[model samples]
Target chain A: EGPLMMNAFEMITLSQGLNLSALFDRRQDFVKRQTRFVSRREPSEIIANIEAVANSMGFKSHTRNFKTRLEGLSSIKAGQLAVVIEIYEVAPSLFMVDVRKAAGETLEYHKFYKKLCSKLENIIWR
Target chain B: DPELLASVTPFTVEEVEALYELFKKLSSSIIDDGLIHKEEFQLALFRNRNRRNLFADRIFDVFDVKRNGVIEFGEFVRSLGVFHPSAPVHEKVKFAFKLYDLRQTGFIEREELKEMVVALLHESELVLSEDMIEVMVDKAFVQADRKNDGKIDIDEWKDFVSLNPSLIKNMTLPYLKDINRT
Candidate 1:
């Protein structure tokens, strides 16, 4: 009852998608945004991991449903940069995560997303 | 004509009609001429029309079978047939090879592979250094070559496709599996 589990081979294709031209034909900035990726981990687990990382990294964090919003102090125009991460269940163990900056500087958002990726580690596939 | 087209393709008449409904929607999304321009195709497939992409342009060029810059209904269904879930693997493999062979040079040489790699990175909105792309291409060749040789034949390409079934994963549209789902 979920999207396809995306086999190992398909992950390779999705990541690089070199030879498969059309598949690679898809995504950036202002408040630099949106990193949509698939995961083999459970939605709950992915959400929990994101929550933990957001807090450990010093963020004003809160969760509602599958959406997690993280706010942090920044010298940007609004005085704070906020990022929103939402996880969707694709299968029992497969999930899709969408991340974007609700408010902030583009460079700050980029820095946050990069650090976020580092914390996520092996949980995300592309 | 649709019956004939359906018979030749892996779609049924009902599915063909459904596709027509979809085609009409797409073709008229921006232009009402019942023709699919590159912008319309981009908007429908990628959900954004402003950002141009090299890889997407190639896909649209391939889809515009007539080479007329606009996709007609006939060209639309015909080109889409190869993406049907039931379409033959051989067909998908051939189409994929066609894409990789940038210059249609009857070969996917090293330069060709590197070019496609850079293009793909841009398509994915990622940037890589020249050395990084070089290493990526080198690693790719390690797998693509069974013999320490250059140039991939259609037969060898077929073998590559088998080794990586995901290479053709996007060739089949899941929506086509149950066209009436929506």
Candidate 2:
């Protein structure tokens, strides 16, 4: 008998379905903050804090459309990268934050961005 | 349109992509059919745990825009966009009205109010005697139906909500604004 025929008697459980976890394994290098209740801090205050930190770190930020948005560039010993941070009021007391490394950069900026997020969170929440 | 959606919702481009990822994860939870069934929706809504909340069914109905008994990606995002907290207060008010309008009659009646109160109480883990429910419903109608028409219209409902903002507090979802898939 061929190998195929020898395995024909294998029993399979129909209850076990396909696993789609692999489809969701992909990740984007960004952080978002969403909560079920309104945030304890105001969007303006959060933006200001981020800007203050950015300035202290030698980054120059420019305000666009609304005070809620701030975009700038920061240069560190590791590399130079563009940064964009947008603050949105999702609810009465809920706000969202997006801090991203500008597109088309070369060196790995995750470490820098990660530290930036941690610092911003500390300042905003504190 | 993504631009329109972004403008209307607190979700940004990254959040949108993240939500799409979540949609994929829950879409095939129960079956490999590539569509989100009610069971999958419930499972995800309750985060894999089981609950007996009447609001789940009603909210699922609102999300199933096509009425095909399942939620598609587009319907999922758009319907969820309604609860983005940043969505206009009028929209939330209208949605609340629809939730209470169980018969889809465009008006809130006494019976529907009672049924809704019962559902809310159950969802919130509050137990009330039948006599107490009846009293609450009667009082609600007396205060909400300003014209004594036995039906609360949109204006009357708005006034009622204004009077008791806490009643609709749960309608807003603060977390939806910062939907981080990663």
Candidate 3:
């Protein structure tokens, strides 16, 4: 049991490198992961693109830089999972996307990351 | 790291980050090892499964800075800096020189120019008879090779490019400058 737990922790660390540490720490009961992306567009434009994509993809969206935080959540798969995307403007031309997922299957977040990231990239890069 | 990258190109921090994301995606397409390989570059550029374009191959060689058969993030960004549209004309001029310099020699020889013309024709799928191609090469040499030497040095190439602006027009990428905008 001891060795198995250590192995699981190591795997979590590797996957967490591309995502978020906070989500990894809470991984026992909830499936939480965060991956970042760098965007050359402005924070506002990136957020707009994200909002448009999320809404179009059937993820009900709300924006505020909201609740005193730069976070937005879109539930998909008929509410079987929730994807939270946050953008932090680290520089004048660099925005970092922090994506988190919860209440999903073990392999579900993997597809979520690829699909969502690809959508955002398609708009931002073009 | 961001500041260092900014010093070299006009890309903003976010733009660099976005480009790095692109680099990651492009690199991950083939090996998923965080390095851009020749196959990945060809696929991204040509959208074809096979790698047969001589022009793309030469451009890939220029981008692969370490000559290690893979492109790292820094090398990818820095090499792309030359085509930023806003970059200096001299930089683009020099890049055109390097592109036509098939032998990796500092000077662009008549033979190298001839080879590049053939490759360009092949890349564009334009077929020219041998005599016509040779005539074209001779005409270029007669107009640009004012020194009557066998090779076109940097100054001579610059003069040639300036006189024939359409030659290097493809070097600029308009979208690069729009990375950081409202």
Candidate 4:
């Protein structure tokens, strides 16, 4: 039971109002409010707990980071498959992990994304 | 005496008494907390696999924290720390009894758990009456077999008790209240 890498994916809501002052003026305040939520976050103990419980039960699972594969792809505006589940067959059973990503400036997001994904991939060797 | 060993010289009464005293002293020295060697724990895990625990893999993983193919003492201590010590002890005793009583064709003989109980209480003498001993042995069996499936497994001993409400309420609650959750 240990430190398995996991991800925290969040969204920045935006609509048709790309009008600079209307949408841009409150961006800092919105980011600040969201940052506060991030600070108070419980820190993804769910996956760690899952891995611990699994190891105690005799199975091993490593969770991966959230990667946004699809965004607002012009054709489908809402919910363009923001989440993806990667499953690894460890034993006679399966360890399924879910990863999610939000649109706009996800370069820093995928940095953690690649890290957790690589860790998950390493579990397949056993 | 058996003919083969009969030719061997037997200890004199005085010699035997002296040896017993020496043995007692040595026993106390050796009786300090046992640190299971790597092989010992590995072998124990092998022996434990004889039981049917659905979550056996979790135990393997708990031991193999780094997934480095070996269980270290640090991880061992951490895994054990997750539960109150008595809970695991109760489960182990119960499982030991069930595995012995597999023939359920008859009642489990009391002698099967004699050594375990002795180890559990850290005393060899049976201060309790025969009837009470029998009950304690029976309770140990029941405690280990919390599922009452008539079979107790090693993992059940290690994992099941971490969630025992009655145990925490009856045992830990007093100590906790004494501290007032400070």
- Candidate number of the best DockQ: 1
Writing each residue's lDDT as its tens digit, candidate 1 over B19-137 gives 78777877897879989898886666555666565556667777777779998988888877898877888999987777667677886777877766666555555444676566657
* TM-score attained by chain A of model 2: 0.52
Pairs with steric clashes in candidate 4: A55-B58, A56-B58, A56-B59, A57-B57, A57-B58, A58-B57, A58-B58, A58-B59, A59-B57
Give the Å error, residue A23, model 1.
Answer: 12
The two-chain DockQ for each candidate, comma-separated, is: 0.10, 0.02, 0.01, 0.01
TM-score, one value per model: 0.65, 0.54, 0.56, 0.20
Pick out the ten consecutive residues of candidate 3 chain B with the lowest summed lDDT: B119-128
CAPRI classification of candidate 2: incorrect
How well does candidate 3 match the true structure in TM-score terms? 0.56
- lDDT per residue as tens, model 1, A1-126: 223342222333443222223221212213223366657776677778888888887678888877788998444455378888777543345465768778876676777788888988888764
Off by over 4 Å in 2: A1-126, B1-10, B47-52, B121-127
> Candidate 4 A-chain TM?
0.25
Candidate that would win on TM-score: 1
The order of the candidates by TM-score, greatest first, is 1, 3, 2, 4
Evaluate residue B176 in candidate 1 and report its C-alpha lDDT on the 0 to 100 scale: 69
lDDT of 1 at B180: 57
After superposition, the stretches of candidate 1 with alpha carbons farther than 4 Å from their true spots are: A1-12, A15-51, A54-126
Clashing pairs in 2: A38-A93, A39-A93
How high is the lDDT of residue B32 in model 4?
27
User: What DockQ number belongs to candidate 3?
Assistant: 0.01
Q: Which should have the higher TM-score, number 2 or number 4?
A: 2
lDDT per model vs. reference: 0.67, 0.57, 0.60, 0.32
Which wins on lDDT, candidate 1 or candidate 4? 1
